[PDB]
From Swiss-Prot, chain A:
rRNA-binding keyword on record: yes
This protein's record includes keyword Magnesium: no
Subunit relationships: Part of the 50S ribosomal subunit. Forms a cluster with proteins L14 and L24e.
GO biological process: translation
Role description: One of the primary rRNA binding proteins, it binds directly near the 3'-end of the 23S rRNA, where it nucleates assembly of the 50S subunit.
Keywords annotated in UniProt: Ribonucleoprotein, Ribosomal protein, RNA-binding, rRNA-binding
Entry superkingdom: Archaea
Family assignment from sequence similarity: Belongs to the universal ribosomal protein uL3 family.
Organism per entry: Methanosarcina acetivorans (strain ATCC 35395 / DSM 2834 / JCM 12185 / C2A)
Designated name of the protein: Large ribosomal subunit protein uL3
Chain's gene name: rpl3
NCBIfam families according to UniProt: L3_arch, PRK04231.1
An example Gene Ontology molecular-function term: rRNA binding
Swiss-Prot record, chain B:
Subunit structure: Part of the 50S ribosomal subunit.
Function as written in the Swiss-Prot or TrEMBL entry: This protein binds specifically to 23S rRNA. It makes multiple contacts with different domains of the 23S rRNA in the assembled 50S subunit and ribosome. The globular domain of the protein is located near the polypeptide exit tunnel on the outside of the subunit, while an extended beta-hairpin is found that lines the wall of the exit tunnel in the center of the 70S ribosome.
Organism in which the protein naturally occurs: Methanosarcina acetivorans (strain ATCC 35395 / DSM 2834 / JCM 12185 / C2A)
Gene3D superfamilies: Ribosomal protein L22/L17 (3.90.470.10)
Polar residues bias: start-end ranges: 1-18
Taxon lineage: Archaea, Methanobacteriati, Methanobacteriota, Stenosarchaea group, Methanomicrobia
Gene Ontology biological-process entries: cytoplasmic translation
Protein name: Large ribosomal subunit protein uL22
GO cellular component, one term: cytosolic large ribosomal subunit
Pfam family, one: Ribosomal_L22
Region (Disordered), start-end ranges: 1-23
Family: Belongs to the universal ribosomal protein uL22 family.
Gene: rpl22
Record-level Gene Ontology MF annotations: rRNA binding; structural constituent of ribosome
CDD domains (UniProt xref): Ribosomal_L22
From Swiss-Prot, chain C:
Keywords: Ribonucleoprotein, Ribosomal protein
Top-level taxon: Archaea
Protein name: Large ribosomal subunit protein uL13
Coiled coil: none
Family matches, as NCBIfam families: L13_A_E (TIGR01077), PRK06394.1 (NF005004)
Organism: Methanosarcina acetivorans (strain ATCC 35395 / DSM 2834 / JCM 12185 / C2A)
GO biological process: negative regulation of translation; translation
Database matches in Pfam families: Ribosomal_L13 (PF00572)
Example of a GO MF term: mRNA binding
Length: 337, 151, 138
RNA sequence: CCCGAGAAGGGAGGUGCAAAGUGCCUGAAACCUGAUAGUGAUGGAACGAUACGGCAUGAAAGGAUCUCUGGCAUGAAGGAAUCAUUCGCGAGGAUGUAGUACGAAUGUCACUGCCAGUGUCGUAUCUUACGUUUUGAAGAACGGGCCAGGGAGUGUAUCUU
RNA sequence: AGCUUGUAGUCCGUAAGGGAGACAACCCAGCCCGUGGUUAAGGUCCCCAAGUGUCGACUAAGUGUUAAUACUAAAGGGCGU
RNA sequence: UGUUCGGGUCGAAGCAGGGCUGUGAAGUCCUGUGGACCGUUCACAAACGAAAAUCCUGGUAAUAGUAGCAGCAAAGCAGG
RNA sequence: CCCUAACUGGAGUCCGGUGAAGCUUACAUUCUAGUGCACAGUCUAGAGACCUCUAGGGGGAAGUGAAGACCCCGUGGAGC
RNA sequence: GGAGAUCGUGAGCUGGGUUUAGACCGUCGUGAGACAGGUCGGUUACUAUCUACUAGAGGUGCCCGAGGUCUGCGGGUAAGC
């Protein structure tokens, strides 16, 4: 038999396609430190999409210098609290948590997530971590941070979300000093990301529940006469006669969406403080209006509205210093029109 | 057709017995309900049965799980056997009355025995395709219940 | 506590397996990355990448990557590990890359007949080299 | 008499040597419900046989110089250890110790209160069911879901032995 | 041709048990029951009872680690050793 | 069946489980249940022994609280 | 059809009631290779495998339905 | 590009071909009838027991009791061509 070839339906790069074990994306890698100390990640909540008219500043592009309409995602980004500093020791079996110091004073609504750590050992915990770093038991340092969604109104929840973030510094001592400076403080998104820079966005995608292989993997439907013989939206064959089994690579029904996904190289087009600049007439549908500080991300982002979106400094960015975008018009017309 | 001996015989002094005689209910569902309610106090068993009949409380189905979805809370497969619960509650009422007649105190007694027994089947028929008639039977269940005032 | 540095992999495994089946001791093996496999580097790497990428690794053989876990697998192949005896033997065995901190400074032993200087040539590679060429971080 | 809507049924209480309680003598198995013994959510499959253990049972019908644990005597085949001398390149061999100590078992004397058996589980070795068709059956060859009962070389005549 | 058809011997068929990974017919062996010992075939690094046995060489190819068997690749070449 | 010698309401046959004997076909005994019949010597007969026949008759499982109770045809709701 | 999307009613899914049938020697959480009547979940050696439940399409069980209607054979038939 | 997966894949589909019963043409045969010749027409059964997979749950094991944040033994990927 002389066969016609096709690329495989869907990607096996995301198998098993199960539901994410948490509603928060977890970062498995952190990029290289390339400058002054700072947090490598922030976290906001997706609001919705709008579009801007901007001058194409992208070097070498055909439309560079002319007016272009660019879709943007609005992400409401209230200040996060640096709740703790955690130290990690590297050994043959990998990284292990070795020490943690919690900030002396923490927000009372953190009790919705965890019983509040007391204002106990912070000075001696920090000196213990300093001794550990001096004696070489510490491989690196991360900052445990959490969001404060109570200030938002389109997100109904008041329980904070907690996550670890890397610190970008040239040396472990510099990392420890910066973490001590930022410990217990409220960091704004301008203290993590700058306008016009590329970032990576992680989020839990839109949940679709249980979906068939046609929607879930993009398999072809039965065609022509076969379309009305009783197996229309349904895979042609589960396998060969031998091997006597259904491969895991055969497209099948199952959970669709509500997965963790990372998008790369999303450009920040605006860091705003007043949500009236971006909120349309009538508000964002099912969300409301922006009230705190916000961010405009060029293009689309994984997740629906109100989903927690984690932003991190780019890990596979190609282009060098991009610049500050020239946003000439932010559309606030009614999205419900 | 006739009366039935009990699988277990508790001592007459501190124990009351009752028998639901060939109820036209589901033996599988009644077995699950009996397994759930065995060992409880009579009052708490009554409250549980009332919750089941009111749909506020599912009974786990560990032996006859097929056809049952999972229920909210710390539970696997479970159902709401309304007819079985009603019949078992009638039998429980009979047993509590018998205890009161003996002079025992049902408020302090426990369901120590709660079993089903398949009885004689009434044989009906289900006309099928192509001239075939297959069975459809009336299964009957005897419910043996033994409460005791000690454990 | 056996130091696997400069020891033939199969001969050390046979010795430790027979000791475990004699069944009066817990055996610890340290520096599993420093064990020796005789034969040409190309041939050893070829056979080990074949074994690593062989099976139905979604639902088939799962050949380990760390050198200590590979040595544990090699000893497992010389045991009745499906039996209760072999299960106890494998439960009484611990293998380490380098020296674990708790065993640090403990008195070690070496198998004289497993020593690598009894080999007649230089055609050998280390288990750590095999593991890191298969992509194990240790 | 009590419960129960009840001319159902159940409980309690009676009758009778015995409930044998009306399709009711006896009342097996399959099947189903519950209890008890063993095991059990890291585990490998003809579901067993053999040996040895854990747990349970071991009233009758089984053992009481019987069971346990030792001593002593005799002990077939077989038969060391250790050491001395010698040979061999060596691993080892030969001679003596030594046909000795031991040794299946057969007797005898103490000690002991269990043992046999039964159920289940575990460790070790072995075994891919049964009947049939087949040169070849665990077969991806045919037959049986299970249990109970029924189910197949008989008589007349004649010939031979 | 694990094809078909002869012949001599021996087997399976109807042949246990032990050993070859398993193996109708390949090796020991024909086998009443129980106990003890010593052997056969085969094996003695572990799985697995007993050698990480001895002597003298070869092989660098994981070649090989495969009595018989249809279950084991040839001609040709090699200043490989 | 003939014949010899017996057992049984102070509990026969049968049934469930167990002990002992016998290589075994099987026999015997114990406990419970059961309520009236049952064996034994030497012989003689047979409608005399079942695990199998897509065996027959009866009973009863897994499948399984599963399929079905959806084209008929807008199918009911309120109050009493 | 390129290339599928949304929506409507009935099923399905979940709940109450009612309630069958068909495959079944046994066991069974398997996968690879070999062996074997040369097409193995059970043999051999490895590799895996914590159990239970729900939904889902049918890879496999040389799945089930059925003493192959093709071929041959039978000193078996029928019609022409 | 070619090939293997029971010439992979009908308890997934199709039914055009071949392989039933009807009929025509040509050629054989006295005939019934025949043709690895042509032509027109010609029913594609099953509610999934086990296993495998895809997903979602309840347990038990691990475990001071609970919660949170992590690591990564491993598995997958075309972390694009």
């Amino acid at each position: 038999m002389a066969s016609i070839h096709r690329p495989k339906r869907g990607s096996l790069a995301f198998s098993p396609r199960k539901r994410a074990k948490s509603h928060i994306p977890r970062f498995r890698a952190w990029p290289e430190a390339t400058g002054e100390p700072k947090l490598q990640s922030f976290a906001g909540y997706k609001v919705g999409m709008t579009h801007v008219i901007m001058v194409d500043d992208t070097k070498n592009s055909l439309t560079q210098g002319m007016e272009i309409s660019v879709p943007v995602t609005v992400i409401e980004t209230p200040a996060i609290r640096v709740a703790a500093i955690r130290a990690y020791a590297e050994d043959s079996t990998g990284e292990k948590a070795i020490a943690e110091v919690w900030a002396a004073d923490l927000d009372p609504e953190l009790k919705r997530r965890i019983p509040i750590p007391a204002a106990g050992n912070q000075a001696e915990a920090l000196e213990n971590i300093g001794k550990l770093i001096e004696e070489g038991r510490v491989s690196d340092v991360r900052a445990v941070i959490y969001t404060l969604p109570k200030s938002l109104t389109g997100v109904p929840k008041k329980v904070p979300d907690i996550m670890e973030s890397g610190i970008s510094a040239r040396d472990l001592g510099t990392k420890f000093e910066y973490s001590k400076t930022i410990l217990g403080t409220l960091v704004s998104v301008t203290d993590v990301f700058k306008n016009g820079t590329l970032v990576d966005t992680a989020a839990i995608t839109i949940g679709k529940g249980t979906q068939g292989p046609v929607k879930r993997w993009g398999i072809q439907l039965m065609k022509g006469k076969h379309s009305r013989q009783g197996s229309l939206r349904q895979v042609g064959t589960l396998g060969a006669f031998n091997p006597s089994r259904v491969s895991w690579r055969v497209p099948q029904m199952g959970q669709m969406g509500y997965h963790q996904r990372t998008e790369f190289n999303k450009r920040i087009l605006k860091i705003g403080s007043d949500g009236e600049e971006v909120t349309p007439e009538g508000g964002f549908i099912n969300y409301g209006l922006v009230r705190g500080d916000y961010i405009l991300i060029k293009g689309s982002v994984p997740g629906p509205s109100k989903r927690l979106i984690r932003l991190r400094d780019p890990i596979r960015a190609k282009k060098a210093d991009l610049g500050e975008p020239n946003i000439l018009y932010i559309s606030r017309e009614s999205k419900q029109g | 057709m006739a009366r039935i001996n009990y699988s277990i015989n508790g001592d007459p002094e501190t124990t009351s017995k009752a028998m639901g005689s060939e109820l036209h209910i589901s033996p599988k569902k009644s077995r699950e309900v009996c397994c759930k309610i065995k060992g409880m106090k009579a009052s708490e068993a009554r409250k549980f049965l009332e919750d089941v009949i009111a749909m506020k409380q599912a009974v786990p189905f560990k032996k006859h799980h097929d056809g049952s979805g999972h229920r909210k809370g710390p539970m696997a497969a479970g159902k709401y056997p309304i007819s079985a619960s009603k019949e078992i509650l009638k039998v429980l009422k009979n047993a509590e009355s018998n205890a009161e007649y003996k002079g025992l105190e049902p408020a302090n007694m426990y369901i120590i025995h709660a079993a089903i027994q398949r009885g004689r089947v009434i044989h009906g028929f289900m006309p099928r395709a192509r001239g075939r008639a297959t069975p459809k039977d009336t299964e009957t269940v005897n419910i043996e219940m033994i409460l005791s005032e000690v454990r | 506590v056996i130091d696997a540095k400069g020891l033939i992999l199969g001969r050390l495994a046979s010795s430790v397996a027979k000791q475990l089946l004699s069944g009066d001791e817990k055996v610890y093996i340290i520096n599993a990355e420093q064990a020796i496999i005789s034969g040409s580097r190309a041939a050893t790497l070829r056979e080990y990448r074949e074994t690593r990428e062989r099976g139905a690794t979604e639902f088939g053989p799962y050949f380990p990557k760390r050198p200590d876990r590979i040595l544990k697998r090699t000893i497992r192949g010389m045991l009745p590990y499906k039996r209760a005896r072999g299960r106890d033997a494998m439960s009484r065995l611990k293998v380490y890359v380098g020296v674990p901190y708790e065993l640090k400074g403990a008195e070690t032993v070496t198998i004289p007949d497993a020593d690598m200087r009894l080999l007649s040539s230089s055609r050998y590679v280390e288990l750590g080299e095999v593991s890191q060429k298969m992509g194990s971080k240790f």
